[PDB]
Amino acid sequence: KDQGNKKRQHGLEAKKSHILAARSVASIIKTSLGPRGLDKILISPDGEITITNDGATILSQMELDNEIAKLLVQLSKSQDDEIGDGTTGVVVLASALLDQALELIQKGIHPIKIANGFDEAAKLAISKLEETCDDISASNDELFRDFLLRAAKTSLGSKIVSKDHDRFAEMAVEAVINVMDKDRKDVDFDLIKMQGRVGGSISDSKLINGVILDKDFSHPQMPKCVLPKEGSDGVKLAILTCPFEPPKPKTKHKLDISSVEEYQKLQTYEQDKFKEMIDDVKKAGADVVICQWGFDDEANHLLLQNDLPAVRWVGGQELEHIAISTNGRIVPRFQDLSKDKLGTCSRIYEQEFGTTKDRMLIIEQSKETKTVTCFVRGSNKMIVDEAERALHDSLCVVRNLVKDSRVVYGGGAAEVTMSLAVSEEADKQRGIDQYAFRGFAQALDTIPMTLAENSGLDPIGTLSTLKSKQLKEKISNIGVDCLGYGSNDMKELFVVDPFIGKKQQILLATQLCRMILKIDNVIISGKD
Amino acid sequence: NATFKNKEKPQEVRKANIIAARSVADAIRTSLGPKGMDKMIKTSRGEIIISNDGHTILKQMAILHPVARMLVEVSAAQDSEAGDGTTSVVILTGALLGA
Amino acid sequence: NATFKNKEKPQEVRKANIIAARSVADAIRTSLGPKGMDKMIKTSRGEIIISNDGHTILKQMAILHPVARMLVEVSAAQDSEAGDGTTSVVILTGALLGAAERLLNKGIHPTIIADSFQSAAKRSVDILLEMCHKVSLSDREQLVRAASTSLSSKIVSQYSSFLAPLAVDSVLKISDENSKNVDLNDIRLVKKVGGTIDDTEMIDGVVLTQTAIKSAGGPTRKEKAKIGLIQFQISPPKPDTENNIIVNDYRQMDKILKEERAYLLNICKKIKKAKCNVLLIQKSILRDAVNDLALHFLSKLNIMVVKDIEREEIEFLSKGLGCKPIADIELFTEDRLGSADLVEEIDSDGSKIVRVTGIRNNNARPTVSVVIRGANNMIIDETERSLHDALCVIRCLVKERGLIAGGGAPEIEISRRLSKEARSMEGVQAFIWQEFASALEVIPTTLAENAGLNSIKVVTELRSKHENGELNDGISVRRSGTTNTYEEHILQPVLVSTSAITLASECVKSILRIDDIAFSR
Amino acid sequence: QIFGDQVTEERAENARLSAFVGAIAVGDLVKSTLGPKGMDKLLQSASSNTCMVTNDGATILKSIPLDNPAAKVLVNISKVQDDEVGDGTTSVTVLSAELLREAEKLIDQSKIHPQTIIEGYRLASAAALDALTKAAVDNSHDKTMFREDLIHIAKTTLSSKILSQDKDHFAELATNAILRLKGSTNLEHIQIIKILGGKLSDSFLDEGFILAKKFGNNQPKRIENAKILIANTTLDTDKVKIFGTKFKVDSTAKLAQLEKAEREKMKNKIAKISKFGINTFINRQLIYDYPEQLFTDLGINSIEHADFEGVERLALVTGGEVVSTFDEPSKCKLGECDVIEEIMLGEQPFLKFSGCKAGEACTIVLRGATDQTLDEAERSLHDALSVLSQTTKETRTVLGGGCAEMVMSKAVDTEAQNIDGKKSLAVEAFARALRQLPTILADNAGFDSSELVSKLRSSIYNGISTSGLDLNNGTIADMRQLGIVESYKLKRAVVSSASEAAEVLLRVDNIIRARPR
Amino acid sequence: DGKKSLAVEAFARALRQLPTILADNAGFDSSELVSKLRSSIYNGISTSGLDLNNGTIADMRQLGIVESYKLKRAVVSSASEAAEVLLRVDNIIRARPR
Amino acid sequence: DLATQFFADRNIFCAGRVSADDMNRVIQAVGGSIQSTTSDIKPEHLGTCA
């Protein structure tokens, strides 16, 4: 239907257009690659103005019609799902491979010959990442934890967090430790909940071994904690979706009252029901009741008088988060409560955060947990957002380091090692393939050059120094002076990347380049 | 990123110089070798001439751009000093300009 | 030579500001003086008016320019504080802005200009005080002469011998000797057709525009009365929502009619239980103030009713009589009632005017009403207009005691004084003061032009004559020349001249400080 | 193809300019308003009927719409200054724009990567901040001279506002209000009452914490030894917080029985309240004649319609509690004061307190010609009280009038003596930006800003680093003899906020706007 | 004095344009070389200058980079007077062309 | 949520919101049948997997 008003590209001209379009869009985030990269202003569909250098946010904000550029977006999604540390690098590298493909096509190298050459060249690069890697966990627990903190501290040094990276580094590493076993070494980032609130500064951020509800137990005269009940199994809580009150109408009462007598009877009926519910909740062995909805005035009066604290207005997901922390279940009715579904925790108390008056309600496990909360503070919305994202990046690094102990130094160091390795092997191809292998090495150079240029360095003088040091003397962890040091040693600077990170970055970036090169015909219709 | 504003743009002249010079070299390039392709020129007198001789072609190409004309002088220098390679000295010039 | 470039050109805004404001001032300028020229204005609604009233001109001028409109606020402040000189303050502002334009062309920063002009204005005020001929508000003859003089430009001037002392007593009732600021809003002027100009009363109570009971049996006059203010409407129930009633027999309709009558009566009876003698009902457009049937019931209760009283009149009743507004029917109680010895309707050639007099209670407050009568609308309108001006002139004499000769007399004297005092100044202030003194001459210049006299000749004669005289020499349109301002009775209250100096200076200050305008939406 | 569906992008080739031009244009909105002799701008909506004049930086920046997202960045930052500090808003906006203005030159002519400009600005900022500390002088001892510093601080912040004419009076009103506290910086303990009539020079300070809403129809006008209980409860009827309930009756007599039952509730309700041991009762809700009389018979004042400001103001000075629950007596906090009076001020009733628990609170009462003059005076005192409160906790001050700015630029130029090459140009740019603030001050005052600032440069360089601009005579004067001082913390805030604001914009190289929703 | 202060500094800014142009023409980063050179001459070491072959800062006495005193006097003298000639001009008046 | 807690206490596994294609493939693999209601269920509606 509607053959007209369509666009079509094919053949040699499509190959030039596809690469040049990929370059134009990929170039957008060139300046995001590096700890000294630049920010961009992103305006939401509603007119809200934000500033970030987050590669994923920028690529997601870019809403474009060029189908080839959309493939670059899909690449970044894969890198985010697996590793998280290569959002920008895989696009920059893939673009460099496409740029090399352009010249290779112009010289008469068939796109298939280009795809095959790059693939085999990538195998050389990946081999070097494994041969030159090292192991962190091969020492002991004290150094292993220290190394995880050091890797986090380095990653946090490019963020607003830097003002107190010691606190956030501990938040990231401890958050992982609390939800993993040393022998299993399976870390699931979904077990670490991110949370923050505008106010104070990032220096007030804290890791909570539990969940935050930020509630006042439903009355200012209610005790600020739930007692351990003379050595019981910690504190037991009820999780209800029905509020601790008789159901109310959704519109108006319209309950005829002929005199004060019937009014008092209505009050009495509620007060008697509130007592009945108090008895049932306590007989269940519950100390505090958390409900999805709020409470009536009479509810708070009877709950206070009988010393039965209750938590108000905790949302659906938040109620499940309580259950996950406390190994409980969400119960639809107060009458269905029993010791087997009531949640167990170490303590339930209000936690003060310096002079902060929120005094947020926390349910704490004080042990291995199914969830932790990483609470982030900051002096503005974007500070909390960036600081929260900073922990996410650190958690991605720590998670990857725990799962696979093998690490490489990727701050432009591994890239030069791999570039030299492919370049030296390219001479051995003795055939047409030499064109693609040499191009592949040149594509790899794009990364340490981009890291240099984004930092205010001459990318050509820098790369020459890096290759000379690794070639003339010995291959070592010699990278780009992005953070600022007296030399290029990435071990003294402590810039460490996971092995599985650099491996997947090249493999996925190569696959993307091949995906675009493999397309010889694009047909675009309208939008219905 | 943010870099040199480049309000004054001297590169625009060098680009025009390289583009004009490389165009001359590519025109001669296709006639290189015993198997090269012929050039046909209609002269200002209306005469039609056909040749693969680089120097003869260059003289009759009537290049206008003040800098591109210098590639014709290069072929003259080759013809004066060596007497051979008059096509190859311009072709190498074009490729090196591309570099 | 060459100087600061100022690539950004806020001076273009300052120029546009002065140009627009001076254009407005030059327009109104032609209306200055008893011989001033009239203007024709076609309003946006198509109605065409002719007037020489300064404020009316500026109001209907439909000024758009964001800064020029300031001159409208100037004329409002002049009218609010002084009540006269609304043309002169605008003309002076224009001339001072012209002085500012010349100073700006000489390279004087607008901050310097504004500050120096303010200093010159402070000296002008002192000079005006020195020139004052002091009067006392206890001397009625001084105040009557001042009022009657200002009224000499009115259509009917002869009755000022009676309207002037009425204005004096009206002000003195509220302007006891130990006072300065007199608020004339406590003097209500109520007019009806009928009678003549002499038939005008100063009343120590509150006079209303509305009539008493129209229905038979109404007392229409009460003695020793307690007076309530009703803000609710006494009318049959008429809900605004949907109602569906089925009537199958006349007996049902009779019950409906009884509901309408009983409702009105039930309110009437509840009102009487409060021991209220006179009902003064606030006007509303929601329902009729009082139904004809309610007047019948209230008449049978020997209650006097005055309906459809204007909101402003309610504000006067609640201050004078001691009575309070009553928001609702159940809230109608004795505590909300005022006091008066007699409430009556007076029919003078059909005036049908209600008067509340004789409060005789500690709740009395110094409120004044005036009863204006006259056969034709023009008679009561000219009486009201004359009293408004007379009250303003007298108010001026209380706030800033004394009169200064008119005809440009203080403008020539102040200009000469500042021209000489400027000789003691140094720097930019000396030059600016000279420009200020020159700007003052716009008034005696304009007066000479509008009077048909040679501009330079008149101003020159005044400047030389003020070598020996101080306030006695000025322009008289009656004598068509420079003559004795006192013998010709050309006098202006100090407050009017003082206000013109202050407000004109404040306007110029405000205008010169505007370097930009931005939209905000 | 690239972006579509109403997406807008500015690529680095042009965004490298917008990132500067936008925020710089913001500076143009307030640069003319800086200083006691600043100039005014007009604001006008499309309706034409909202035309106003102001020199208030925050008003101008918030009122004027911006089309450049980069411009909006700086205004949002400047807002934070206005909310968190309460002063220096204009100085941050102007200095931030000038820091970016010179940085644009460092891109245009010097070809310095933004990363080097930012790093240089960070080092230059440290030099400027160090200068402020070294030049900071306190009078912590001899509180007699400390009070004098507060007066100069009060006049400095009050200047350029409507109160600048009468600052000799309002400086003491603001100073006394804060000096009375000698303690907490919480401005809630100082209220401003806005009364029409009279001159602003007639403003008074009244320790009685005057409240502007009268109570009662017929109640005692003076109570001694008062216990204060605040409420939010219905005392008019039963059926409290029940909505839609009706009473079906066959007669008005039956309806009257309902009203009698309501009175039965009111009698019991007031009795239970009276058992708290109170002398004045404050209800956020209305109190009808019945519960009012029930209170009156007990000697208890009945205050009705105590809205948000009513409760918060009265609760603070009395030290009480809103008490939403009255089920049992003596289960809440009561306030206390010695005397409560009904007082007439300008022929308007007010509530006057005396002898309140911890009665350090006070109010300043304004007497204005019209609402505009009162609103401007109210905010003017608020700003001065905020800065004065900060000087109560931070007793160090610095010299104003451009002195602190020139002294900082001296240190910044000194820092450039020993620094990397391209960073030197960044540091020099920072110093040049600092010297623009005293340039704007001299310019707006109508003086030869080039002569005044250039002479100030020589004065501060060649010793005697006490001099600054005399913005009244147009010359150079000693700021300590002239009496122009500014809070140390405030001046630090201006440098810190402006430095960060520049960095935020310097890091921008692209603007992307998603499809409108 | 105040008014003349900026003119004196402007003169210095003009003087340092020559080493900027020298570096730029040599294809080097003039912003780095000139800024660093100034810091060298400022903090004593008044022997240093541009090495327009290696792209660095070098001791001119060791390299042998010298220029005649008389010529430098002529260059400064002529440049100063040359500016003054046009600084004194603010109007251009032409007679009828022939 | 209630249904799955009820069924879980009965040691019964639930999975809802399953696509029409996936539901058919399950039933077609185990030999059962889909019933709209709960009151009308027959034992021949049940299937079995290994």
Swiss-Prot record, chain A:
CDD domains: TCP1_epsilon. Transmembrane segments: none annotated. It comes from the Eukaryota. Its main location: cytoplasm. GO terms for molecular function: ATP binding; ATP hydrolysis activity; ATP-dependent protein folding chaperone; unfolded protein binding. It is found in: Cytoplasm. Keywords: ATP-binding, Chaperone, Cytoplasm, Nucleotide-binding. The keyword Chaperone applies. It holds the Pfam family Cpn60_TCP1. GO terms for cellular component: chaperonin-containing T-complex. InterPro entries: Chap_CCT_epsi (IPR012718), Chaperone_TCP-1 (IPR017998), Chaperonin_TCP-1_CS (IPR002194), Cpn60/GroEL/TCP-1 (IPR002423), GroEL-like_apical_dom_sf (IPR027409), GROEL-like_equatorial_sf (IPR027413), TCP-1-like_intermed_sf (IPR027410), TCP-1_chaperonin (IPR053374). Heterooligomeric complex of about 850 to 900 kDa that forms two stacked rings, 12 to 16 nm in diameter. Belongs to the TCP-1 chaperonin family. NCBIfam families: chap_CCT_epsi (TIGR02343), thermosome_alpha (NF041082), thermosome_beta (NF041083). This is T-complex protein 1 subunit epsilon.
Swiss-Prot record, chain B:
Coiled coil: none annotated. It is found in: Cytoplasm. It comes from the Eukaryota. Heterooligomeric complex of about 850 to 900 kDa that forms two stacked rings, 12 to 16 nm in diameter. Present with 5530 molecules/cell in log phase SD medium. Belongs to the TCP-1 chaperonin family. Molecular chaperone; assists the folding of proteins upon ATP hydrolysis. Known to play a role, in vitro, in the folding of actin and tubulin. In yeast may play a role in mitotic spindle formation. This is T-complex protein 1 subunit delta. It comes from Saccharomyces cerevisiae (strain ATCC 204508 / S288c) (Baker's yeast). The lineage of its organism: Eukaryota, Fungi, Dikarya, Ascomycota, Saccharomycotina.
Swiss-Prot record, chain E:
It is found in: Cytoplasm. Heterooligomeric complex of about 850 to 900 kDa that forms two stacked rings, 12 to 16 nm in diameter. Interacts with PLP2; this interaction leads to inhibition of CCT complex mediated actin folding. Belongs to the TCP-1 chaperonin family. Molecular chaperone; assists the folding of proteins upon ATP hydrolysis. Known to play a role, in vitro, in the folding of actin and tubulin. In yeast may play a role in mitotic spindle formation. This is T-complex protein 1 subunit beta. The chain holds residues 423 to 520 of 527 of the full protein.
Curated annotation (Swiss-Prot), chain F:
It is found in: Cytoplasm. Molecular chaperone; assists the folding of proteins upon ATP hydrolysis. Known to play a role, in vitro, in the folding of actin and tubulin. In yeast may play a role in mitotic spindle formation. Belongs to the TCP-1 chaperonin family. Heterooligomeric complex of about 850 to 900 kDa that forms two stacked rings, 12 to 16 nm in diameter. This is T-complex protein 1 subunit eta. It comes from Saccharomyces cerevisiae (strain ATCC 204508 / S288c). The chain holds residues 301 to 350 of 550 of the full protein.
